Design an enzyme around this catalytic site. Structure first.
Site, PDB file in Angstrom:
ATOM      1  N   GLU A  76       0.795  -1.237   0.000  1.00 61.04           N
ATOM      2  CA  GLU A  76       0.000   0.000   0.000  1.00 61.04           C
ATOM      3  C   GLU A  76       0.830   1.290   0.000  1.00 61.04           C
ATOM      4  OE1 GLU A  76      -2.740  -0.309   3.276  1.00 61.04           O
ATOM      5  OE2 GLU A  76      -3.191  -2.422   2.835  1.00 61.04           O
ATOM      6  N   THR A 106       0.143   2.801  -8.169  1.00 57.64           N
ATOM      7  CA  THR A 106      -0.347   4.136  -8.497  1.00 57.64           C
ATOM      8  C   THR A 106       0.686   4.913  -9.315  1.00 57.64           C
ATOM      9  OG1 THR A 106      -1.560   4.111  -6.398  1.00 57.64           O
ATOM     10  CG2 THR A 106      -1.457   6.204  -7.576  1.00 57.64           C
ATOM     11  N   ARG A 162      -8.193   1.044  -5.418  1.00 55.67           N
ATOM     12  CA  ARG A 162      -7.293   0.145  -4.703  1.00 55.67           C
ATOM     13  C   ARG A 162      -7.446  -1.283  -5.218  1.00 55.67           C
ATOM     14  NH1 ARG A 162      -2.669  -1.670  -2.934  1.00 55.67           N
ATOM     15  NH2 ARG A 162      -2.903  -3.170  -1.214  1.00 55.67           N
ATOM     16  N   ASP A 196       6.524  -3.783 -11.522  1.00 60.96           N
ATOM     17  CA  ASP A 196       5.647  -3.630 -10.364  1.00 60.96           C
ATOM     18  C   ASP A 196       5.597  -4.951  -9.598  1.00 60.96           C
ATOM     19  OD1 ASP A 196       3.876  -2.473  -8.561  1.00 60.96           O
ATOM     20  OD2 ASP A 196       2.130  -2.599  -9.873  1.00 60.96           O
TER      21      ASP A 196
HETATM   22  N1  LIG Z   1      -3.806  10.336  -0.890  1.00 61.66           N
HETATM   23  C1  LIG Z   1      -2.902   9.563  -1.536  1.00 61.66           C
HETATM   24  N2  LIG Z   1      -3.257   8.289  -1.851  1.00 61.66           N
HETATM   25  C2  LIG Z   1      -2.399   7.463  -2.496  1.00 61.66           C
HETATM   26  C3  LIG Z   1      -1.070   7.966  -2.854  1.00 61.66           C
HETATM   27  N3  LIG Z   1      -0.431   6.966  -3.475  1.00 61.66           N
HETATM   28  C4  LIG Z   1      -1.275   5.904  -3.514  1.00 61.66           C
HETATM   29  N4  LIG Z   1      -2.453   6.209  -2.933  1.00 61.66           N
HETATM   30  C5  LIG Z   1      -3.621   5.312  -2.760  1.00 61.66           C
HETATM   31  O1  LIG Z   1      -3.293   4.297  -1.805  1.00 61.66           O
HETATM   32  C6  LIG Z   1      -3.740   3.014  -2.253  1.00 61.66           C
HETATM   33  C7  LIG Z   1      -2.549   2.077  -2.453  1.00 61.66           C
HETATM   34  O2  LIG Z   1      -1.895   2.339  -3.695  1.00 61.66           O
HETATM   35  P1  LIG Z   1      -1.173   1.164  -4.522  1.00 61.66           P
HETATM   36  O3  LIG Z   1      -0.414   1.823  -5.642  1.00 61.66           O
HETATM   37  O4  LIG Z   1      -2.181   0.090  -4.858  1.00 61.66           O
HETATM   38  O5  LIG Z   1      -0.148   0.571  -3.432  1.00 61.66           O
HETATM   39  P2  LIG Z   1       0.908  -0.613  -3.721  1.00 61.66           P
HETATM   40  O6  LIG Z   1       0.358  -1.813  -2.981  1.00 61.66           O
HETATM   41  O7  LIG Z   1       2.180  -0.059  -3.127  1.00 61.66           O
HETATM   42  O8  LIG Z   1       0.951  -0.764  -5.220  1.00 61.66           O
HETATM   43  C8  LIG Z   1      -4.530   3.263  -3.527  1.00 61.66           C
HETATM   44  O9  LIG Z   1      -5.924   3.343  -3.220  1.00 61.66           O
HETATM   45  C9  LIG Z   1      -4.022   4.594  -4.037  1.00 61.66           C
HETATM   46  O10 LIG Z   1      -5.017   5.315  -4.767  1.00 61.66           O
HETATM   47  C10 LIG Z   1      -0.758   9.362  -2.480  1.00 61.66           C
HETATM   48  O11 LIG Z   1       0.353   9.851  -2.758  1.00 61.66           O
HETATM   49  N5  LIG Z   1      -1.694  10.081  -1.841  1.00 61.66           N
HETATM   50  F1  ALF Z   2      -0.069  -3.850  -1.337  1.00 65.77           F
HETATM   51 AL1  ALF Z   2       0.517  -3.658  -3.025  1.00 65.77          AL
HETATM   52  F2  ALF Z   2       1.104  -3.546  -4.721  1.00 65.77           F
HETATM   53  F3  ALF Z   2       2.218  -3.583  -2.444  1.00 65.77           F
HETATM   54  F4  ALF Z   2      -1.183  -3.651  -3.599  1.00 65.77           F
HETATM   55 MG   LIG Z   3      -0.430  -2.300  -5.913  1.00 59.00          MG
END
Ligand SMILES: Nc1nc2c(ncn2[C@@H]2O[C@H](COP(=O)(O)OP(=O)(O)O)[C@@H](O)[C@H]2O)c(=O)[nH]1
Ligand code: ALF
Ligand SMILES: [Mg+2]
Ligand SMILES: [Ca+2]
Lengths: 316, 756
Positions: free
Chosen positions: A13, A18, A147, A169
């Protein structure tokens, strides 16, 4: 033509996926109206997931519903199976609107720190009217806010002018990090993402350990690895907008007591966090290029990645 | 939307039919019923003997036109055009396509056959029914004993002895132990033959030291009980697939662990204290939640919007043949059987009809094989093409017929018989041009695509070539030429040995070719007894239409039927990401892991089996893996059991497959055999979907129909792969706090000693 391989790594997360979407918006093919309809279902599901998480938290944390009639709404929404949701109609629209308006649910939202709730919840729930619309088409921000948990390893090639970036990714959760070794060959650069807002939260996979503690430890570990001897390390301290909001009422001192700076100051807090990550690494000798980002903000990431492009090419 | 098998109230209470037969011309009024669980179709025939048909053995049900009509004049006299034929029902069952028994019924009531035909078909093709829990299969065995009763309505003891015919002395002792009747000459009241008493009988019949060993392994030395926490920790640690995401596939909470105890634990004393006894634990192992596979793999859950060249497609070779190539019958039924079984590509060798009729007919290369008319085959294809699967069917013509008139007839036949389902002109989205990809199975749902030459086989005409579009066969020059042309609608066929040549000499060009266009493969002429080549050989280089002889159920066909069960028996399996992407490329012969592809490691330990044979004989189990050449092993084999066939236990070392380079292409085959080599049963499991922990593997026959009693207990560990040297690094990524915490402590301890 030259091809360079970058890794998007980070704990769950943090914003990895994103960032990929911003790369697609800025450098890739972007989102047509057709592509945006593909996310309509995902937005509906995000809302049902979020409200279900809050309905369960009313029981867990023993918060009473302010208005009596919302108990029946709570029972309606909790029974839904989110996987089979493909539409957002009544009675579920009014049920969720009525629940979101309940002071008890609002108090439960205020204490979202004490359980797992996605960070785009307020964004969507304040905008129910727009989503509930029968002719609703997700905006580009709607798509960035959605998400969808990443699993495994997905490589996205992006055609910039002077070079092709093959960005990988990956999933951030602990089980996912066992798979990471299968994308470590021939890495030009690591781009590590960190949720600045996670300082006062605990992990989904382990509800007794601090989220930033993991992110810090993961980063300080990963940069000392043989695969990345000749690789640059960009550090994105993400979600700076959520830090601005939280730092006003959740004190960094209470979770990292070595912080001696003032309360309610985001700059002081983010700079302390940057310090925790980069400073004093006996094993590491390489320069780390940090940037404070908000991955949902396209113009921020356009500027930020233009700088990171120049930095990576310079070194290679 | 995969609902469990539901038996409508009509089928429960029953309906009146007259069961007739063409062989002996027998006529008997009977009442057809189906038991609530939908295990057996059963009726009471002559005098009062109860007959049963196992619904899982059904291959098709038919009514109206498609029902088999009574040609015998004696039977037809007792019956009676449109309305008489409208209430016929033919049930087709059998262990394989070739060996089919036909059971004919005719209802007394109007539009009854239509309901029974349709409803039986749904029960027969139900996915949850075929992949039932171990317990459900034991409940099926129970149901059989309760249906097959004597004329006075009681369950005869000899039927129980027949069902467990291996060690009949032990069966008597178990029956005596429950206070049941146990002499061969007597019978038991259904009243007295409870399901609980049947379960109690099975427990005293088969002693389970293997399940005791497992309880002791899971932190229970005080063994008769097991706490909620122990159970939950067991399910989360041992029984869980470690490759799965903790968010997408959350772990078991204590509230859910409670619900499992409420469900399975029989003893009230353990239930109220939140514990689980051996009886509760033994039930859970064979329960609905602890299956070896997840429901996603069996469900139609694959992306069906990718181009047609991006899928492995289930394919038949000379479908019409029931036995050998040189001599044997040509059957129209084989087309029905193949298409019902999920085949999406069938072959038709059409020939020139003789002067009087001039009706095109199908047969083998003018050999000593019989002939069947073309009209009947096309009509049988339309009938069954989209009965078990909505996704497109390709007609692979080997067109002879060197006459314009008969060529226009067969083109006219296709048009009128298939109607809108026949694809005659291209779609708007996908023109027949360079650089345009092949349409998706999604885009071609419920469509018949013809594959025939245009402008050995005979040339085409204006009528037959104009039906061809997305699947035009052309003589293969080279992969250089195919890439130069850039046409996805052109395809080529390869005889086995020519396909083997391209495989060994140009494997990577072949995979790149199959990203854009199609390749069909068929066996060589030498295989006159209809032998099959291992299809895995060419799936490894991305070949989509790997055609096999469906009449021959060797290991090759067993694998084919096994893998194509998955993705909802659609007949299309999506190829690995790297075999579909134009910007990627790997060597099919890699002995080393590929970057970008998460490899796996598999552990298979064969613990025990149950009711494997109907007689006392030793049994061994083979554990093979199919996939890329590096992933393929098939020397693993257990020691032949001690002579026990009721409940043999193997004290065996585990069978390791330490490096699965491309697991999404890898299928594990578990197969049981009697001492001597006789086949008992088997199972094909996709490595990428297989679960870890202790699971029952309910066995299937050669044709992939589920056997009821035979089953194995196996322990598995399917994990993401980690090399030896790079193991310490992995542990740190999974749990970095522990490591960084240790390093920061070491430094903090050196604080005073460093000084300065
Ligand atoms: N407010 C805000 N939300 C974010 C930001 N970056 C990601 N998100 C939100 O946090 C959630 C996790 O993002 P995601 O890219 O799926 O996380 P990952 O598991 O690291 O790929 C998603 O619902 C995004 O829209 C940010 O810089 N600001
Ligand atoms: F929790 Al992720 F890509 F790291 F959805
Ligand atoms: Mg993700
Ligand atoms: Ca042929």
């Amino acid at each position: 033509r030259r091809e360079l391989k970058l890794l998007l790594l980070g704990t769950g997360e943090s914003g990895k996926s994103t960032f990929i979407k911003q790369m697609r918006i800025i450098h890739g093919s972007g989102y047509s109206d057709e592509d945006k309809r593909g996310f309509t279902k995902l937005v509906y599901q995000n809302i049902f997931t979020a409200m279900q998480a809050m309905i369960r938290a009313m029981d867990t944390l023993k918060i009473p519903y302010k208005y009596e009639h919302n108990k029946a709404h709570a029972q309606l929404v909790r029974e839904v199976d989110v996987e089979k949701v493909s539409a957002f109609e009544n009675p579920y629209v009014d049920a969720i609107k009525s629940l979101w308006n309940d002071p008890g649910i609002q108090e439960c939202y205020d204490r979202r720190r004490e359980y797992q709730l996605s960070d785009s919840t307020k964004y969507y729930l304040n905008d129910l009217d727009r989503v509930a619309d029968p002719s609703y088409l997700p905006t580009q921000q709607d798509v960035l806010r959605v998400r969808v948990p990443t699993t495994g390893i997905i490589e996205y090639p992006f055609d910039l002018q002077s070079v092709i970036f093959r960005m990988v990714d990956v999933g951030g959760q602990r089980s996912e990090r066992r798979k990471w070794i299968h994308c470590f060959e021939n890495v030009t650069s690591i781009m590590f993402l960190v949720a600045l807002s996670e300082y006062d939260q605990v992990l989904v996979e382990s509800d007794n350990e601090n989220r930033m503690e993991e992110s810090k430890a993961l980063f300080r570990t990963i940069i000392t690895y043989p695969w990345f001897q000749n690789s640059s390390v960009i550090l994105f301290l993400n979600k700076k907008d959520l830090l601005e909001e939280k730092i006003m009422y959740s004190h960094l001192v209470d979770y990292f007591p070595e912080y001696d700076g003032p309360q309610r100051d985001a700059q002081a807090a983010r700079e302390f966090i940057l310090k925790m990550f980069v400073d004093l690494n006996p094993d590491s000798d390489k320069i780390i290029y940090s940037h404070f980002t908000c991955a949902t903000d396209t113009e921020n990431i356009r500027f930020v990645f233009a700088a990171v492009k120049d930095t990576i090419l310079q070194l290679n | 939307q995969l609902e469990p098998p539901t038996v409508v109230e009509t089928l429960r209470r029953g309906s009146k039919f007259i069961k007739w037969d063409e062989e002996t011309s027998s006529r008997n009024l009977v009442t057809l019923r189906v038991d609530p669980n939908g295990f057996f179709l059963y009726w009471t025939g002559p005098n009062m003997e109860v007959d049963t048909l196992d619904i899982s053995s059904i291959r098709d049900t038919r009514t109206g036109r498609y029902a088999r009509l009574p040609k015998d004049p004696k039977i037809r006299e007792v019956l009676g055009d449109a309305r008489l034929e409208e209430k016929l029902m033919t049930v087709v069952s059998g262990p394989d396509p070739v060996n089919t028994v036909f059971l004919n019924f005719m209802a007394v009531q109007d539009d009854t056959a239509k309901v029974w035909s349709e409803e039986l078909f749904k029960l027969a093709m139900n996915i949850l029914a075929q992949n039932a829990s171990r317990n459900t299969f034991l409940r099926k065995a129970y149901t059989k004993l309760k249906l097959q009763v004597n004329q006075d309505g009681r369950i005869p003891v000899k039927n129980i002895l027949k069902m467990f015919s291996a060690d009949k002395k032990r069966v008597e002792t178990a029956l005596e132990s429950c206070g049941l009747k146990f002499n061969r000459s007597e019978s038991i009241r259904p009243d007295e033959f409870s399901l609980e008493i049947f379960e109690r009988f099975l427990n005293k019949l088969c002693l389970r030291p293997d399940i005791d060993k497992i309880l002791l392994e899971i932190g229970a030395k005080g063994k008769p009980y097991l706490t909620l926490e122990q159970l939950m920790d067991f399910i989360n640690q041992k029984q869980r697939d470690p490759r799965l995401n903790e968010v997408l596939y959350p772990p078991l909470r204590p509230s859910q662990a409670r619900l499992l105890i409420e469900k399975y634990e029989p003893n009230q004393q353990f239930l109220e204290r939140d514990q689980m006894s051996m009886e509760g634990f033994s039930r859970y192992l064979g329960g609905e939640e602890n299956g070896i596979l997840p429901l996603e793999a069996l469900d139609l859950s694959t992306d069906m919007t990718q181009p047609l060249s991006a899928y492995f497609i289930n394919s038949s070779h000379n479908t019409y043949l029931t036995a050998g190539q040189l001599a044997g019958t040509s059957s129209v039924e084989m087309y029905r059987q193949a298409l019902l079984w999920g085949c999406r590509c069938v072959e038709l060798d059409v020939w020139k009809g003789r002067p009087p009729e001039e009706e095109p007919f199908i047969t083998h290369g003018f050999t000593m094989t019989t002939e069947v008319p073309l009209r009947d085959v096309l009509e049988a294809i339309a009938e069954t093409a989209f009965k078990t699967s909505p996704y497109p069917v390709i007609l692979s013509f080997e067109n002879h017929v060197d006459s314009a008139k008969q060529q226009a007839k067969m083109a006219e036949y296709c048009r009128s018989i298939f109607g809108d389902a026949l694809l005659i002109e291209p779609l708007d989205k996908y023109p027949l041009a360079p650089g345009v990809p092949l349409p998706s199975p999604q885009d071609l749902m419920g469509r018949i695509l013809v594959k025939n030459k245009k402008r050995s086989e005979v040339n085409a005409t204006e009528e037959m070539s104009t039906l061809v579009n997305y699947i035009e066969p052309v003589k293969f020059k080279s992969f250089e030429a195919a890439r130069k042309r850039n046409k996805c609608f052109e395809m080529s066929s390869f005889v086995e040995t020519k396909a083997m040549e391209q495989l060994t000499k140009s494997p990577m060009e072949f995979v790149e070719y199959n990203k854009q266009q199609l390749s069909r493969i068929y066996p060589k002429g030498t295989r006159v007894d209809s032998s099959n080549y291992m299809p895995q050989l060419f799936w490894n280089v991305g070949c989509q239409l790997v055609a096999l002889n469906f009449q021959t159920l060797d290991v090759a066909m067993q694998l084919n039927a096994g893998v194509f069960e998955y993705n909802g028996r659609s007949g299309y399996l999506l190829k690995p990401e790297f075999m579909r992407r134009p910007d990627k490329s790997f060597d099919p012969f890699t002995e080393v892991i590929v970057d970008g592809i998460v490899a796996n490691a598999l552990r298979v330990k064969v613990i025990s089996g149950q009711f494997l044979s109907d007689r006392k004989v030793g049994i061994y189990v083979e554990v093979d893996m199919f996939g890329l050449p590096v992933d393929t092993r098939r020397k693993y084999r257990t020691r032949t059991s001690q002579g026990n066939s009721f409940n043999p236990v193997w004290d065996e070392e585990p069978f390791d497959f330490p490096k699965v380079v491309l697991p999404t292409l890898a299928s594990l085959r578990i197969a049981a055999f009697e001492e001597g080599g006789k086949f008992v049963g088997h199972r094909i499991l996709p490595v990428s979907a297989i679960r870890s922990g202790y699971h029952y593997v309910c066995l299937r026959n050669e044709a992939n129909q589920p056997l009821c009693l035979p089953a194995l207990l196996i322990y598995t560990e399917a994990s993401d792969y980690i090399p030896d040297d790079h193991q310490d690094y992995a542990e740190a990524l999974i749990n970095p706090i522990k490591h960084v915490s240790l390093m920061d402590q070491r430094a903090r301890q050196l604080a005073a000693l460093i000084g300065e």
